[PDB]
PDB file of N, CA and C and ligand atoms in Angstrom:
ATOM      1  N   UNK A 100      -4.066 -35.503  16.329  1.00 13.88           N
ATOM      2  CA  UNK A 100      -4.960 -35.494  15.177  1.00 13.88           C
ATOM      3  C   UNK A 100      -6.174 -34.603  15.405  1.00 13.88           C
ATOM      4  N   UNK A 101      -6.573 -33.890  16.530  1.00 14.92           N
ATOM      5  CA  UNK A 101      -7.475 -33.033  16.731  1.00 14.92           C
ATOM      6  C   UNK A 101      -6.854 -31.484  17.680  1.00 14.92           C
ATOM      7  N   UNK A 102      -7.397 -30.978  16.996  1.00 16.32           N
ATOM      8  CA  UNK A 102      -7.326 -29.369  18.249  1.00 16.32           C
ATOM      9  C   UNK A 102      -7.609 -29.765  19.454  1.00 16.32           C
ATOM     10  N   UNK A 103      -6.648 -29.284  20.575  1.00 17.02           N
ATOM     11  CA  UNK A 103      -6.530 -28.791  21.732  1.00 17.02           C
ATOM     12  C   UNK A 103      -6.230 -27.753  22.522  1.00 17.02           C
ATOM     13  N   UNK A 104      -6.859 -26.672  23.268  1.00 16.48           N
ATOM     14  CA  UNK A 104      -6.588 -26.059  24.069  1.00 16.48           C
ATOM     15  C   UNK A 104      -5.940 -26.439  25.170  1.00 16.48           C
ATOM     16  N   UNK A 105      -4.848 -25.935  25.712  1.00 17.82           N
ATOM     17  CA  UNK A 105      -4.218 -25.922  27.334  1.00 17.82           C
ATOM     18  C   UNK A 105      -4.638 -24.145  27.609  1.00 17.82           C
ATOM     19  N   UNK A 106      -5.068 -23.989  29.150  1.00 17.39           N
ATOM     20  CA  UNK A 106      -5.363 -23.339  29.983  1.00 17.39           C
ATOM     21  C   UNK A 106      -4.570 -23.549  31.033  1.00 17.39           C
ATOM     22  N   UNK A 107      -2.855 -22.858  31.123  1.00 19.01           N
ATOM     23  CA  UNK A 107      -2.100 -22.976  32.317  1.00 19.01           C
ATOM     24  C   UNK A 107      -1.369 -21.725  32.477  1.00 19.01           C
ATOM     25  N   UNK A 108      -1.100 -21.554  34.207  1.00 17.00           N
ATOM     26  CA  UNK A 108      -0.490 -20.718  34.476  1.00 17.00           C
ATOM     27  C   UNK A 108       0.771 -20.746  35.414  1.00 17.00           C
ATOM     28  N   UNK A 109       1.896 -20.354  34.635  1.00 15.48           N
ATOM     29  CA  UNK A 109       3.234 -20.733  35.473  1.00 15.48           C
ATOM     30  C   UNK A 109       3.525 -19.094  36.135  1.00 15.48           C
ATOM     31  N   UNK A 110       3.309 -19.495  37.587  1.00 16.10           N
ATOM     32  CA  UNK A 110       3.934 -18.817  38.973  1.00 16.10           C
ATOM     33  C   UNK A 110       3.696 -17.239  38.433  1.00 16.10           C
ATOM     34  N   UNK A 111       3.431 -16.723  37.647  1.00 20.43           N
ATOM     35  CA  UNK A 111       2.889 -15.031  37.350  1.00 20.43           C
ATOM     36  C   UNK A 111       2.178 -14.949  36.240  1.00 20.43           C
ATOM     37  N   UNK A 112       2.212 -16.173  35.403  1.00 23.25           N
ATOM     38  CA  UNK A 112       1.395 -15.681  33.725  1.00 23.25           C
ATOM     39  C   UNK A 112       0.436 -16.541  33.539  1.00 23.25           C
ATOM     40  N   UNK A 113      -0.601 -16.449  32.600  1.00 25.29           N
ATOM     41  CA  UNK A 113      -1.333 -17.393  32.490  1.00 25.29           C
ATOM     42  C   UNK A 113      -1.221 -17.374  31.039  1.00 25.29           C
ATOM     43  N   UNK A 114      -1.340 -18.837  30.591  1.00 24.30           N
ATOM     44  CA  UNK A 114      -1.364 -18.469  29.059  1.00 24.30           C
ATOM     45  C   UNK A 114      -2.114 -20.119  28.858  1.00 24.30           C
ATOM     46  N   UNK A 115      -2.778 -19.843  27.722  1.00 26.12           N
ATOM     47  CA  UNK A 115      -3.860 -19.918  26.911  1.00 26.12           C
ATOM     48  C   UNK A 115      -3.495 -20.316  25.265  1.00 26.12           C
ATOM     49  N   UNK A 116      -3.438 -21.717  24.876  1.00 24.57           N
ATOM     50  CA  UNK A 116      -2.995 -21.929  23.934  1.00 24.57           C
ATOM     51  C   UNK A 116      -3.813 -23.139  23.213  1.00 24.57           C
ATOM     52  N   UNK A 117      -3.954 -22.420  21.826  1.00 23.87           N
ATOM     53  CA  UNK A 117      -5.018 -23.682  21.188  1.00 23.87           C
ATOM     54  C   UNK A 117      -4.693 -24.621  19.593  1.00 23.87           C
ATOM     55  N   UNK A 118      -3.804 -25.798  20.063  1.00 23.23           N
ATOM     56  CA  UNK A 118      -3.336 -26.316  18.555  1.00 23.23           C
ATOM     57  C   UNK A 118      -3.151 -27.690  18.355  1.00 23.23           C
ATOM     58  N   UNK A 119      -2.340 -28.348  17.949  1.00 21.54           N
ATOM     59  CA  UNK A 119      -2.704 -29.735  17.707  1.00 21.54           C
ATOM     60  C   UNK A 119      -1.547 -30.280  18.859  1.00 21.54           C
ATOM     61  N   UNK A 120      -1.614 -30.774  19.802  1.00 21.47           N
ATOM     62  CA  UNK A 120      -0.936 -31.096  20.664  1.00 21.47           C
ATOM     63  C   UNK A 120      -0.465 -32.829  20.931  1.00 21.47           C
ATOM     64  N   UNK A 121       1.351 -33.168  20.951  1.00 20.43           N
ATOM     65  CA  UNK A 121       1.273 -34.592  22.176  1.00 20.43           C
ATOM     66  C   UNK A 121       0.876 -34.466  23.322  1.00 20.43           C
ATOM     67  N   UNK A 122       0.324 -34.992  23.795  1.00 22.58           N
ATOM     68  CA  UNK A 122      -0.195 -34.821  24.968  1.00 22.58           C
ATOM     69  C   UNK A 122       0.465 -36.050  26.368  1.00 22.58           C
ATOM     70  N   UNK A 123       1.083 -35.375  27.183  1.00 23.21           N
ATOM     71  CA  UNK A 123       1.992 -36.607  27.981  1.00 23.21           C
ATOM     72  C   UNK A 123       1.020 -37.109  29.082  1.00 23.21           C
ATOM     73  N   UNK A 124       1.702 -38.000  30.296  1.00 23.39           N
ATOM     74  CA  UNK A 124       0.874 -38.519  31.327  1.00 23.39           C
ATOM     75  C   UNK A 124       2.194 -38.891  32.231  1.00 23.39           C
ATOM     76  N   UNK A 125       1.744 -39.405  33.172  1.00 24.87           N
ATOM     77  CA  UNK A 125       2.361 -40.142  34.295  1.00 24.87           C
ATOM     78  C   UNK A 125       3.250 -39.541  34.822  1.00 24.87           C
ATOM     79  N   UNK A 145       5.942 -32.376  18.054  1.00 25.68           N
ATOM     80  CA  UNK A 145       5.577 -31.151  19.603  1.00 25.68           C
ATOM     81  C   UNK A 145       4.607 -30.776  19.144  1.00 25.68           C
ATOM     82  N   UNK A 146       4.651 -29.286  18.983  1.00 26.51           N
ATOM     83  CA  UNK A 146       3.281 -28.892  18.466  1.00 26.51           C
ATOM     84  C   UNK A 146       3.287 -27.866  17.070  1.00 26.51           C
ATOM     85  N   UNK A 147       2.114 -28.276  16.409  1.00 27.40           N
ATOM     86  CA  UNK A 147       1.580 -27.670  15.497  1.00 27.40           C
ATOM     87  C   UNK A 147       0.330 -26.836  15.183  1.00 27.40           C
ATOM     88  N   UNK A 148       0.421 -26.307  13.731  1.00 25.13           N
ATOM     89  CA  UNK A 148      -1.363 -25.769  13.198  1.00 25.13           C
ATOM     90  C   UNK A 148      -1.706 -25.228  14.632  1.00 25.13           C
TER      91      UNK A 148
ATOM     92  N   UNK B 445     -10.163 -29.834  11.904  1.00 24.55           N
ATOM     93  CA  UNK B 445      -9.369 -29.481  11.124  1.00 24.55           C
ATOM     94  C   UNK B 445      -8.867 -31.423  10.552  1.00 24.55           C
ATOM     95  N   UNK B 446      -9.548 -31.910  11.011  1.00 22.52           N
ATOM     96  CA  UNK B 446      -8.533 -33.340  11.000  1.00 22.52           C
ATOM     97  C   UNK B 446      -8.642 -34.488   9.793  1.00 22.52           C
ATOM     98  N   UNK B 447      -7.562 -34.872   9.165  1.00 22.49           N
ATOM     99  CA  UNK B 447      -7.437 -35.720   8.576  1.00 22.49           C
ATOM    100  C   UNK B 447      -7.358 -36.997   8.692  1.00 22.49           C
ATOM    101  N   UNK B 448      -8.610 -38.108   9.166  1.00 26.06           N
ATOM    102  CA  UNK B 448      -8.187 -39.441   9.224  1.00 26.06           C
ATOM    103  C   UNK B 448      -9.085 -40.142   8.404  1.00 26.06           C
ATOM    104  N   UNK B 449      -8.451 -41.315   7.732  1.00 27.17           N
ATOM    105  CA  UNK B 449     -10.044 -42.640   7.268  1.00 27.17           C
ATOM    106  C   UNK B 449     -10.999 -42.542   7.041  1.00 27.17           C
ATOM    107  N   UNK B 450     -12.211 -42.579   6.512  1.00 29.21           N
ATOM    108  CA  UNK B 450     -13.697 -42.221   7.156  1.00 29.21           C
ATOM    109  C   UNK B 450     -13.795 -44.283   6.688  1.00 29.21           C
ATOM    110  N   UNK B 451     -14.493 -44.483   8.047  1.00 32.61           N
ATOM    111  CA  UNK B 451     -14.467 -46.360   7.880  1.00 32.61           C
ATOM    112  C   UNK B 451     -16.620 -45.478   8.214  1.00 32.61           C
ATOM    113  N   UNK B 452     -17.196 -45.663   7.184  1.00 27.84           N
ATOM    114  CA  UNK B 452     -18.877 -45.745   7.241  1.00 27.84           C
ATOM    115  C   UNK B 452     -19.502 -46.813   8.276  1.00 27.84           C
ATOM    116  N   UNK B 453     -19.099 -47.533   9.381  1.00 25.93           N
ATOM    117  CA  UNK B 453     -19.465 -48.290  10.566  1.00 25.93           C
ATOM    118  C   UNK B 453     -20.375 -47.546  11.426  1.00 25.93           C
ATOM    119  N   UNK B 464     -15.398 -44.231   0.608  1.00 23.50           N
ATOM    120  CA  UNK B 464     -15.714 -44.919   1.506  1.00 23.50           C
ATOM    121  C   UNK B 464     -14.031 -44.800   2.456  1.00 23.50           C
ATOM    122  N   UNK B 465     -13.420 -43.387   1.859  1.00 23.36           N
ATOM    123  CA  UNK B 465     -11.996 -43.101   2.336  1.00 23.36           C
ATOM    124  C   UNK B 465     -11.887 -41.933   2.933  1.00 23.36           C
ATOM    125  N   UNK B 466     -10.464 -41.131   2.460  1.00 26.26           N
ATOM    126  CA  UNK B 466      -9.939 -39.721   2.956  1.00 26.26           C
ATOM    127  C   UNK B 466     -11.452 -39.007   2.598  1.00 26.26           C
ATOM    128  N   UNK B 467     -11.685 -38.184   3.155  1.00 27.71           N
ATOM    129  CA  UNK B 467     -13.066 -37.624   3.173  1.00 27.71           C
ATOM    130  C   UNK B 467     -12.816 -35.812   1.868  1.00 27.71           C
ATOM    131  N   UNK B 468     -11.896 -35.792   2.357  1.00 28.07           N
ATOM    132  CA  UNK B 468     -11.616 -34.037   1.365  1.00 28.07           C
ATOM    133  C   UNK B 468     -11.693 -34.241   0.166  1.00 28.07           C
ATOM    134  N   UNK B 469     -12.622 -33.743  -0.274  1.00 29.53           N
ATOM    135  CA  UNK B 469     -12.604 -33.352  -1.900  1.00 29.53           C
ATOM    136  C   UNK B 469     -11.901 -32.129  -2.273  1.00 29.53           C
ATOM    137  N   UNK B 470     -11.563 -32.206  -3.174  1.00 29.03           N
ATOM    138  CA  UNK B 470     -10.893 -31.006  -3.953  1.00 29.03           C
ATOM    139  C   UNK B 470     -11.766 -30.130  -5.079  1.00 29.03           C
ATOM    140  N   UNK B 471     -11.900 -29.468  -5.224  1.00 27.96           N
ATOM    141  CA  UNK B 471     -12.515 -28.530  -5.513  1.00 27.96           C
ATOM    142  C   UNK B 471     -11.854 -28.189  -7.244  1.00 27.96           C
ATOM    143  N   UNK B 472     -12.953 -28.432  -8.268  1.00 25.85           N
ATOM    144  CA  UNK B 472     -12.385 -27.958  -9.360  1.00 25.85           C
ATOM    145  C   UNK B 472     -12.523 -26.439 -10.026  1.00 25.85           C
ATOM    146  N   UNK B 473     -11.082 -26.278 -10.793  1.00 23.15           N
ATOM    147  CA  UNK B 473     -11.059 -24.760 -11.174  1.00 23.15           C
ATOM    148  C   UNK B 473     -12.340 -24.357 -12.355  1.00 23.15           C
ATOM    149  N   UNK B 480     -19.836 -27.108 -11.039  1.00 24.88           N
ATOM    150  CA  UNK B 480     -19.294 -26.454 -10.588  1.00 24.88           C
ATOM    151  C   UNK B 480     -19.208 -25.356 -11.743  1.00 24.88           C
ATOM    152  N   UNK B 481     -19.073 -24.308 -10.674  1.00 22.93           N
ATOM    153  CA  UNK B 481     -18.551 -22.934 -11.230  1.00 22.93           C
ATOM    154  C   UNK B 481     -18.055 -22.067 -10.993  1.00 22.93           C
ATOM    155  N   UNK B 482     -17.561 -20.839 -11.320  1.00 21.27           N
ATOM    156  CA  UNK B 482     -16.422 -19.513 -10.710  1.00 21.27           C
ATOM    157  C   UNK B 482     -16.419 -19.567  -9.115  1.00 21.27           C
ATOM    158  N   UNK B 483     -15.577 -19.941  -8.642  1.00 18.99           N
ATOM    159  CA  UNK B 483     -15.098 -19.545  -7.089  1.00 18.99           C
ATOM    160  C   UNK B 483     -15.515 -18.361  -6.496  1.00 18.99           C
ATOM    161  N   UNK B 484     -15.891 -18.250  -4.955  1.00 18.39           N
ATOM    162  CA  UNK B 484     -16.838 -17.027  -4.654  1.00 18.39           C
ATOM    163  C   UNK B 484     -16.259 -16.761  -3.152  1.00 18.39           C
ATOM    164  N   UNK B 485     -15.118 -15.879  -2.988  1.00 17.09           N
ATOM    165  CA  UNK B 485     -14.891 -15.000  -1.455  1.00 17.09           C
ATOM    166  C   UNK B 485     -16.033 -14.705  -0.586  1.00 17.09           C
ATOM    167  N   UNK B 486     -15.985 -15.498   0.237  1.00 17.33           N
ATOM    168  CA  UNK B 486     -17.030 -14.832   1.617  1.00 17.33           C
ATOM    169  C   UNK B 486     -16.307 -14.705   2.730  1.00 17.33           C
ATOM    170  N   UNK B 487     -16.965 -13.354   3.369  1.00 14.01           N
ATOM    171  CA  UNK B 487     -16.333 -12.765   4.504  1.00 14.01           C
ATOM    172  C   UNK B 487     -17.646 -12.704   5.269  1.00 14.01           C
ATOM    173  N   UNK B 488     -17.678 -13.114   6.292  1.00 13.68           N
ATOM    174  CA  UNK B 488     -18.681 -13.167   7.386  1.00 13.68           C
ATOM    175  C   UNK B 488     -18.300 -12.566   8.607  1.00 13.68           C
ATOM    176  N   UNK B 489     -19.129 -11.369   8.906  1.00 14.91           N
ATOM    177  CA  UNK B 489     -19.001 -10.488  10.080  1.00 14.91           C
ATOM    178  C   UNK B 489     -20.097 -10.528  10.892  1.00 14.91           C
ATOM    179  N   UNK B 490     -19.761 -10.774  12.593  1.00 13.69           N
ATOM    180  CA  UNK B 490     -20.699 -11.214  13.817  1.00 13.69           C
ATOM    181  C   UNK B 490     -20.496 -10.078  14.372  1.00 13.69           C
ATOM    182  N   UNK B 491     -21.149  -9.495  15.043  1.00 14.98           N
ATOM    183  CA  UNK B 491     -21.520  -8.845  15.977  1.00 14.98           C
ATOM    184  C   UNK B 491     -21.676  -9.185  17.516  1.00 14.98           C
ATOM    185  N   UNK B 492     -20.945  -8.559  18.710  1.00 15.31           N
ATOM    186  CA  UNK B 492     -20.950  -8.714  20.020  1.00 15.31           C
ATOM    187  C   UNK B 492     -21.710  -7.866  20.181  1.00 15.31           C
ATOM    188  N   UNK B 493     -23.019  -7.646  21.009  1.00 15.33           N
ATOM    189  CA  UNK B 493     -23.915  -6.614  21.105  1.00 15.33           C
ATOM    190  C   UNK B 493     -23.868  -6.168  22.959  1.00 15.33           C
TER     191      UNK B 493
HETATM  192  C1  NAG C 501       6.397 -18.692  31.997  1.00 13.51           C
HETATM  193  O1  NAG C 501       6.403 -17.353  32.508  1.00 13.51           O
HETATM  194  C2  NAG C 501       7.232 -16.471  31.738  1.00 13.51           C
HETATM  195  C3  NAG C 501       7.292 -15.160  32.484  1.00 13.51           C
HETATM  196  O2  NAG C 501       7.159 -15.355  33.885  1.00 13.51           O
HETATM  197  C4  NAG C 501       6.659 -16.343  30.331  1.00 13.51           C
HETATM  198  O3  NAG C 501       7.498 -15.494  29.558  1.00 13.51           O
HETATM  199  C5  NAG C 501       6.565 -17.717  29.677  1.00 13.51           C
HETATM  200  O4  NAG C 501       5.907 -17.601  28.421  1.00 13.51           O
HETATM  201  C6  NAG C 501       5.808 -18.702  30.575  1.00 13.51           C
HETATM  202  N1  NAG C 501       5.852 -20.042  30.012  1.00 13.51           N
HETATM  203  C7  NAG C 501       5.020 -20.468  29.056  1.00 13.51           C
HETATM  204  C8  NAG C 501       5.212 -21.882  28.599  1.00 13.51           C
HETATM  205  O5  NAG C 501       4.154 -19.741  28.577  1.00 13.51           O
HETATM  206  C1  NAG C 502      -2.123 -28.346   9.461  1.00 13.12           C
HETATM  207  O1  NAG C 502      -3.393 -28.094   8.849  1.00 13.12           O
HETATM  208  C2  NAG C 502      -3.386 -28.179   7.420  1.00 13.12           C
HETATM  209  C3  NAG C 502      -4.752 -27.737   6.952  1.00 13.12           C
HETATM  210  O2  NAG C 502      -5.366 -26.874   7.901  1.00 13.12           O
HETATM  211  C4  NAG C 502      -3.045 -29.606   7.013  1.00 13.12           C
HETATM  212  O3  NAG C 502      -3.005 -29.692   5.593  1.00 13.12           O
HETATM  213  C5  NAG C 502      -1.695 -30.000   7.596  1.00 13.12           C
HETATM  214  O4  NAG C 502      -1.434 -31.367   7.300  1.00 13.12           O
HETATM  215  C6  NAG C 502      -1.651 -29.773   9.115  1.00 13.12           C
HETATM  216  N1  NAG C 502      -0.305 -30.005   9.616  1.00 13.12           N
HETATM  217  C7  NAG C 502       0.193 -31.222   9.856  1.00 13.12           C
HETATM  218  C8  NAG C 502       1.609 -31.269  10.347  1.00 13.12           C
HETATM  219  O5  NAG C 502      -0.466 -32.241   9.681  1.00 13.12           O
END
């Protein structure tokens, strides 16, 4: 229900992504 | 951007906009100096 940015980088890229996210522990839109 | 409830601690908060008077385009340009 709110904007989120992720700031991750897999093994050569970094990428940078900002939208309405599930967010897991222990899809996406807009 | 978000759509939930508004509980004043008297609903959906968005108004709609009627076709007040004539509708007005703005474009806003910033500058990095
Ligand atoms: C993982 O890296 C590849 C290239 O190494 C890239 O194309 C891909 O977008 C990356 N994964 C994500 C989720 O961005
Ligand atoms: C995406 O945003 C628009 C307005 O910016 C909203 O009307 C819409 O409900 C959002 N998408 C979802 C799946 O909720």
């Amino acid at each position: 229900k709110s904007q989120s940015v992720i700031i991750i980088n897999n093994s050569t890229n970094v990428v940078i992504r900002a939208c309405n996210f599930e967010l897991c522990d222990n899809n996406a839109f807009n | 951007i978000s759509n939930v409830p508004f509980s004043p601690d008297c609903y959906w908060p968005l108004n709609d906009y009627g076709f007040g008077y004539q509708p007005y385009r703005v474009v806003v340009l910033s500058f990095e100096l």
